Each structure stands twice: as structure tokens, then as C-alpha cells.
Design an enzyme around this catalytic site. Structure first.
Site, short mmCIF file in Angstrom:
data_model
loop_
_atom_site.label_atom_id
_atom_site.label_comp_id
_atom_site.label_asym_id
_atom_site.label_seq_id
_atom_site.Cartn_x
_atom_site.Cartn_y
_atom_site.Cartn_z
N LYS A 186 -1.15 1.21 7.78
CA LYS A 186 -1.03 0.32 6.64
C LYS A 186 -1.94 0.71 5.49
CE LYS A 186 2.18 -2.65 7.60
NZ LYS A 186 3.39 -2.77 6.74
N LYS A 187 -2.94 1.56 5.73
CA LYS A 187 -3.75 2.06 4.63
C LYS A 187 -3.02 3.10 3.77
CE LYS A 187 -8.64 1.34 5.61
NZ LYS A 187 -8.41 0.17 6.50
N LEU A 188 -1.85 3.58 4.20
CA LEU A 188 -1.06 4.53 3.43
C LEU A 188 -0.26 3.77 2.36
CD1 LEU A 188 0.19 7.09 6.10
CD2 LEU A 188 -1.61 7.37 4.39
N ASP A 189 -0.96 3.40 1.30
CA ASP A 189 -0.39 2.66 0.19
C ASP A 189 -0.46 3.49 -1.08
OD1 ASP A 189 0.90 0.62 -1.10
OD2 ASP A 189 -0.78 -0.81 -1.04
#
Ligand SMILES: CCCCCCCCCCCCCCCCCC(=O)O[C@H](COC(=O)CCCCCCCCCCCCCCC)COP(=O)(O)OCC[N+](C)(C)C
Ligand SMILES: *[C@@H]1O[C@H](CO)[C@@H](O[C@@H]2O[C@H](CO)[C@@H](O)[C@H](O)[C@H]2NC(C)=O)[C@H](O)[C@H]1NC(C)=O
Ligand SMILES: *[C@@H]1O[C@H](CO)[C@@H](O[C@@H]2O[C@H](CO)[C@@H](O)[C@H](O)[C@H]2NC(C)=O)[C@H](O)[C@H]1NC(C)=O
Ligand SMILES: *[C@@H]1O[C@H](CO)[C@@H](O[C@@H]2O[C@H](CO)[C@@H](O)[C@H](O)[C@H]2NC(C)=O)[C@H](O)[C@H]1NC(C)=O
Ligand SMILES: *[C@@H]1O[C@H](CO)[C@@H](O)[C@H](O)[C@H]1NC(C)=O
Length: 642
Positions: A186-189
Site C-alpha cells: 500500500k506504500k506504492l502510491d
């Protein structure tokens, strides 16, 4: 075999259901599970009277003053103060029973019930750590951890030094791996790969040696954003392998200690540190001292179903269209910590009478205790329902309630989030359908922010520039004050009309045109194009402008001839100087005085919580005495010990 040496299992056990069932129920030593149980119990005992609100219970559900609640289910209504104190007493007794490891099942039930009740009672206080505590409580309820270093061994010899199944370790390891991997994925934004989020965190003094070898932009880009993602991926992966055990444990401990020092999250980092050493061999505390049945199938079916549910849950925002918002869904049950930030500017609440037709304005934060309702639709709907049921208490008829909320996400254009012409009281909201009264975000201005960066390389540093995007059909009314000298408006894109009501003059503007607004009068901007409009306010008014003009005058007088009732301005400047000197003194202050003050404040919090619990228990058991003695006990309880 190297396959069974590294992976710990063989392929041939996965070929059959019975072979997998016989594989998953191999006995093991219970020592590390008991160590984790003791650490979790002690940390929860220390954590209950600080963050959950045991000290601040008296001002959250105080009688008389009605506050609009925000429950998940509308049928939920909180109990009075004595019953809530009894519920917290029962939860603390269950936490103590889980800490000492005596009557494990009843203690786990008495800890699992009121914590889930409180977590479902409030939506504004949702976070990652409460959800993790609930999940760990539900996981550890079913397992057996009372076979080593507990009072249950002293009270019963049958449950001392006994083996435990493998799936009790497997569920916890899978849960920690799921949390780490979901946070990493979820940090891949799009906003996180560009470093805009949490960009101001590099100025903290705990990053002090990191500036010695890297520049400020490099430290803010490579270390905070990419390094955190790499640390999350390594914390997910390296704990499984025996080769990368100690270095991964050191990295996990350093990351948890740095995050505990940097932020004010609470005791989440200590719980993560307690759950960190579970990935080692199951006999690691012991060296410090010196046909399958149906339940075997149940212990594997529960493990597989729980792992599948916890894998599916953080990506289940596509079914919650009712709770869907600008970013996604509700907050807290997606493990996406520290991704987005908010900066609210103005909130205006208008009401129209259903009988007289008069128009009035309400207070911004009246009858509410939280500031999280300005980003979610369901909280707005429940606030509208509460205000609709509350407003006849003040000689108001059946009202029409109109909202106007402005918000900006990650330093973007200040645009409206909802349409200000839709009555929320008579509107419709359903959990399984997309809402029709939410304005979409304008992502087309994302490269032009770099153009705004060019504007950021424009004119004097003391000047102020505000980027405003406006929907077609709406109007923005503002009051430029008398002191706001040299206020100009430049149009970037669209077709707008600017109206001044003091002389009743309205003009149409084109792209690239500039206008000078009057100071001390009300003005309005209307969008008169089918497309949404984008524009910018360029103005400088404040005490920075006044001090810059006085500094230029003083510098000119200095270079010509010279050197460089109370007085509120001089006293304010001396107060700012004393604030800077107090910051420098706090930096020069040794840690023992601050530690003593912190310990005194924590002891005051614990004493107030214990005294309020004792007073509520005495009122529940022995009845309510006269109000003079109760007021005396309230005054005695609120006194600092010293
Ligand atoms: C018809 C249907 C058939 C079945 C369909 C579903 C099949 C699911 C298969 C996937 C799930 C397998 C779970 C295995 C759990 C397991 O083996 O339990 C444990 C392993 O730990 C776990 O519970 C695993 C946690 C998740 C790890 C994921 C690793 C993924 C690796 C992918 C390939 C590389 C036994 O080992 P141990 O830790 O007790 O000790 C050995 C390890 N060392 C030596 C390092 C200390
Ligand atoms: C007042 O209006 C704006 C600030 O609100 C300023 O206008 C600038 O005018 C100067 C020259 O006087 C130019 O160098 C700038 O490029 C202008 N601003 C722009 C286009 O962004 C100025 O402070 C005041 N206006 C005038 C005419 O003095
Ligand atoms: C200048 O023109 C604008 C554009 O029509 C006028 O704004 C409208 O205002 C009237 C009442 O003042 C409303 O009935 C209209 O619905 C408004 N238009 C829109 C599109 O909403 C403005 O009133 C004019 N001002 C003067 C002084 O003539
Ligand atoms: C516009 O300029 C004024 C200059 O007076 C700014 O105001 C002062 O405002 C602060 C609060 O921010 C007060 O504490 C001071 O007492 C004010 N100074 C006075 C009255 O002499 C003001 O902040 C600027 N900005 C806006 C948006 O009005
Ligand atoms: C009018 O409102 C006031 C205050 O809200 C209160 O006295 C009462 O609700 C109303 N009084 C009368 C006489 O209707």
C-alpha cells in the site's frame, strides 16, 4: 534435504488433505508463546489507562450535554457513566487475568468483549493499533498459552510443561507478515513515489547525523520514502529465513525504536517489538532458564479461512461504495499509515427555516467533539440527522441544512468536496451504491503544480499565492479586508466574471488577464463557462509586509546616517524572543527534569483514573450520597499529588 531444511516442509504433505492435516498439527515447545503472552498482557495493562480514555471518561460521556455520536450501527447507544466505568473495570480485570495467565479462556473472553464494543462504539477514534489489538486478541483467544510460566501451573499440575500445535505459531507469523506486506504494497502510491507526502519530516533533530553526509533534499527523498518502503519489505521478508535472522531483527528493532521516538502513536511500537522475536526457534526462551481427529481439521480450516479473510480485507474497498470518498473508503482498516495529510481552511453551515423561510448560520464545530467528520460522507449524513433531530430545542422549525466545506489534500488546489445546494437531511445514502453528491477531484492540474513551482520562482518571497479551482455554476464570495493592500487576481484557465457589490459592477475576464481588487469591500467570483475554472490569488498584506516596509525604511535610514500605557507590539516581540529563549533552554535542559514532570503527569493520570473508578464503583454499589460530599471527592480527585 535442502528443501525441508530451508522451507521447513515438503511438497508431498500438500498432496492430500489428510497429509496436510497431519502436517499442521506437529507438537512444539510453548515457551516463546508464553513470553509473547506475558509481554502482550503487561503492555496492554500499561496501555489501557493512557490512550483508551480511562482518565478522560468523565468528559466524553457526561450526562446532560448531548453530543452527536458516530456509531457504525444506528441501534448502538452508549450506557451511562457508572455502567461504562464498570465495563472498563471488567476489561481491566480481563487484561490482568490475561497478563497473569490464570483462567485463560474467561480472561480472553472478558478482554475480547468490551474492547470490540468500544471499538465499534466510535468511528472518529479508529486507528491501526486498535484494529491490530483486536485482531491479536481474537487470534490469541483460541490458542493455548498457559503451559509455561503461569499461575495456572501452580494451581493445576495438569496444564504445566505441555506441548502446543504449530498453527498457533503459524497464525501469528502470518498475521505479522500480512501486516508488513500489506503496508509495503500500500506504500506504492503515486504521491509517495514523488516524495510530496511527509516531506517536512526531514527537519527533525533525530535526523541530525543524516544531514552530515547527505543534503536536505536527498535525506528527504531517499531515506524517508524509499528507505521506509525497503525497510517494510525487509521486515516482511528477512524474518522467515534463518540466514537473515539477526540483521533483520536489528533492522526491525531500529525501525520500531526510531518510529517510537519520532511520533506520538503510543504503545504500538512496543507491541511490534514484543511480536518481533516470535520468528526465531521455539526453544529460544528455554536456554535462558538453563488418524487425526476433527479438531485437527478445525485448526487448519480456521487458519486457512482467517488467512484468506485477512488477505482479502485490505483490498475490499471496491464493495464499500457507500463509505467511499475522495481517496478510498473509511480509515484504519487498510494499514496505509502516514500516507495523506489534511489542511482545512473554512467550513460554513447554513440553515433555512421550513416555516418562516429565514436564513441563518451555525457555528463551525458546535455539538461535536471530533474533527474527522469533514472528509467522510456517512459522518456528514449522521451529523445532518442529529442536527435535524436536535434543532427544535432552540425554537427552530423543520430545517433545511446546507454545508460548504473546503479542503486540500497533499498541497493541491482548494476545491469544494460536496455540492452546496443539496439538502443532506432529505438526501439518500446507501452502503452498496455510489453517492451522487460528491464532487470529483481535479487531477488535471497535477503537472501544472510544477508550473506553480515556476510561479513559486516568481516575485518577492514575502508575497502570497493561493491556487483556487472552482466548479461551474457555483460562486465564491469573499471579503478582502481594508488592510489587504496590493491585492491582485490573475486568471489561469476558464471563463469567469468578477463582481463588486459596493458599486454594482461585474466584468468578464479572459485567460492571462489581471485585475486589482478593492480593499475593504465584498467581492464575488462566478464561473460562467461549461468547464471548471482555475485561477490564483496574488496578495501580500500581513505583519510580514508591514515589517518588510519598516525594515526597508530602517535600512535606508541606517545607510543614510545611523545604526540599525503599555506597548503591545514590543511586548509581543519580547514574548517571541522569550519563546525562542525557552526553546533554547529546553534544548539546554538536562533530561531528568522533563522525565520527572512526565512521570508526575502519568502518575496523576493513573491516580485520577483509579480514583474515578473507585468513586464510580462506590456509587454503583453503595448508592449516590449527597452532592456536597460528591463535590468534595471530585475536588479531591482532581488535585495534583505533588
Ligand atoms: C485442494 C486444496 C489444496 C490446498 C490449497 C491451499 C494450499 C496453501 C499452501 C500455502 C500455505 C502453506 C503454509 C505452510 C506453513 C508452515 O509450513 O508452517 C511453518 C512455516 O511458517 C509459516 O507458518 C509460514 C508463514 C508464511 C511464510 C510465507 C513464505 C512464502 C515462500 C514462497 C516461496 C519462496 C513451519 O515452519 P516453522 O516456522 O515452524 O519452522 C520451519 C522454518 N525455519 C526452519 C525457517 C525456522
Ligand atoms: C499589486 O498587484 C500585484 C500584487 O498583488 C503586483 O503586480 C506586479 O507588478 C509588478 C510590477 O509593478 C510586476 O513585476 C509583477 O509581475 C506583477 N505581478 C504579477 C503579474 O504576478 C504588484 O505588487 C502590484 N501591482 C502594481 C502594478 O504595482
Ligand atoms: C452581473 O452578472 C452576473 C451574471 O449574470 C449576475 O449574477 C447573477 O445574479 C442574479 C441576481 O443578482 C441571479 O439571479 C443569477 O442567477 C446570477 N447568475 C448566475 C449564473 O448564477 C450579477 O447579478 C450581475 N451584477 C450586476 C450588478 O449587474
Ligand atoms: C493581514 O494583515 C494584518 C495586519 O494587521 C494581519 O494581522 C494582525 O493579525 C494577527 C493575527 O494573525 C493579530 O494577532 C494582530 O494583532 C494583527 N495586527 C494588528 C491588528 O495590527 C493579518 O493576519 C493579515 N491576514 C489576514 C488574512 O487578515
Ligand atoms: C424561544 O426560544 C428561547 C430560547 O431558545 C426559549 O425561551 C424557548 O425555546 C422559546 N420561548 C418561547 C416563549 O416560545
Amino acid at each position: 534435504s535442502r528443501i525441508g531444511k530451508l522451507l521447513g516442509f515438503e511438497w508431498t504433505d500438500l498432496s492430500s488433505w489428510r497429509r496436510l492435516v497431519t502436517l499442521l498439527n506437529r507438537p512444539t515447545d510453548p515457551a516463546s508463546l508464553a513470553v509473547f503472552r506475558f509481554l502482550f498482557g503487561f503492555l496492554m495493562v500499561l496501555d489501557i489507562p493512557q490512550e483508551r480514555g480511562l482518565s478522560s471518561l468523565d468528559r466524553k460521556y457526561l450526562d446532560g450535554l448531548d453530543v452527536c455520536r458516530f456509531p457504525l450501527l444506528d441501534a448502538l447507544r452508549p450506557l451511562p457513566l457508572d455502567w461504562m466505568y464498570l465495563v472498563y473495570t471488567i476489561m481491566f480485570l480481563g487484561a490482568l487475568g490475561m497478563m497473569l495467565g490464570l483462567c485463560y479462556r474467561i480472561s480472553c473472553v472478558l478482554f475480547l468483549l468490551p474492547y470490540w464494543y468500544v471499538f465499534l462504539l466510535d468511528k472518529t477514534s479508529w486507528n491501526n493499533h486498535s484494529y491490530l489489538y483486536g485482531l491479536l486478541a481474537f487470534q490469541l483467544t483460541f490458542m493455548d498459552a498457559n503451559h509455561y510460566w503461569s499461575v495456572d501451573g501452580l494451581l493445576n499440575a495438569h496444564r504445566r510443561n505441555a506441548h502446543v500445535p504449530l498453527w498457533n505459531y503459524a497464525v501469528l507469523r502470518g498475521q505479522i507478515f500480512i501486516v508488513y506486506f500489506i503496508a509495503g504494497v500500500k506504500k506504492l502510491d503515486a504521491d509517495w513515489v514523488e516524495g510530496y507526502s511527509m516531506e517536512y519530516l526531514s527537519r527533525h533533530w533525530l535526523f541530525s547525523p543524516f544531514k552530515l553526509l547527505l543534503s536536505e533534499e536527498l535525506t528527504s527523498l531517499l531515506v524517508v520514502h524509499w528507505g521506509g518502503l525497503l525497510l517494510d519489505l525487509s521486515a516482511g521478508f528477512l524474518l522467515f529465513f534463518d540466514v537473515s535472522r539477526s540483521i533483520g531483527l536489528f533492522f526491525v528493532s531500529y525501525f520500531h525504536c526510531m518510529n517510537s521516538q519520532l511520533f506520538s502513536i503510543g504503545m504500538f511500537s512496543y507491541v511490534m517489538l514484543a511480536s518481533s522475536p516470535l520468528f526465531c526457534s521455539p526453544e529460544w526462551p528455554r536456554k535462558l532458564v538453563s488418524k487425526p481427529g476433527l479438531r485437527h481439521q478445525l485448526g487448519a480450516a480456521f487458519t486457512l479461512l482467517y488467512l484468506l479473510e485477512q488477505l482479502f480485507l485490505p483490498y475490499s474497498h471496491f464493495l464499500t461504495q457507500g463509505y467511499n470518498n475522495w481517496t478510498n473508503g473509511l480509515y484504519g482498516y487498510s494499514w496505509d499509515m502516514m500516507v495523506h495529510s489534511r489542511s482545512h481552511q473554512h467550513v460554513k453551515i447554513t440553515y433555512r427555516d421550513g416555516r418562516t423561510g429565514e436564513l441563518g448560520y451555525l457555528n463551525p464545530g458546535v455539538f461535536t467533539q471530533s474533527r474527522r467528520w469533514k472528509d467522510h460522507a456517512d459522518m456528514l449524513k449522521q451529523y445532518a440527522t442529529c442536527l435535524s433531530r436536535l434543532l427544535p430545542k432552540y425554537n427552530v422549525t423543520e430545517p433545511q441544512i446546507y454545508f460548504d466545506i473546503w479542503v486540500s489534500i497533499n498541497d493541491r488546489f482548494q476545491q469544494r468536496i460536496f455540492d452546496p445546494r443539496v439538502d443532506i437531511v432529505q438526501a439518500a445514502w446507501s452502503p452498496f451504491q455510489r453517492t451522487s453528491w460528491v464532487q470529483p477531484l481535479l487531477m488535471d492540474l497535477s503537472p501544472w503544480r510544477a508550473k506553480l513551482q515556476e510561479i513559486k520562482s516568481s516575485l518577492d518571497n514575502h508575497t502570497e499565492v493561493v491556487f483556487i479551482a472552482d466548479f461551474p455554476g457555483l460562486h465564491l464570495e469573499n471579503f478582502v479586508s481594508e488592510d489587504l493592500g496590493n491585492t491582485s487576481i490573475q486568471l489561469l484557465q476558464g471563463e469567469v466574471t468578477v463582481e463588486l457589490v459596493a458599486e454594482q459592477k461585474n466584468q468578464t475576464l479572459r485567460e492571462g488577464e489581471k485585475m486589482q481588487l478593492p480593499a475593504g469591500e465584498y467581492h464575488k467570483v462566478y464561473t460562467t463557462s461549461p468547464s471548471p475554472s482555475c485561477y490564483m490569488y496574488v496578495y501580500v498584506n500581513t505583519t510580514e509586509l508591514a515589517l518588510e516596509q519598516d525594515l526597508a525604511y530602517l535600512q535606508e535610514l541606517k545607510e543614510k546616517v545611523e545604526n540599525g500605557e503599555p506597548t503591545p507590539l514590543v511586548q509581543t516581540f519580547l514574548r517571541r524572543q522569550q519563546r525562542l529563549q525557552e526553546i533554547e533552554r529546553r534544548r539546554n535542559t538536562p533530561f531528568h527534569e522533563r522525565f520527572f514532570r512526565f512521570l508526575l503527569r502519568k502518575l496523576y493520570v493513573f491516580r485520577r483514573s483509579f480514583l474515578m473508578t473507585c468513586i464510580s464503583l462506590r456509587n454503583l454499589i453503595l448508592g449516590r450520597p449527597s452532592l456536597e460530599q460528591l463535590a468534595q471527592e471530585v475536588t479531591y480527585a482532581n488535585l495534583r499529588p505533588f
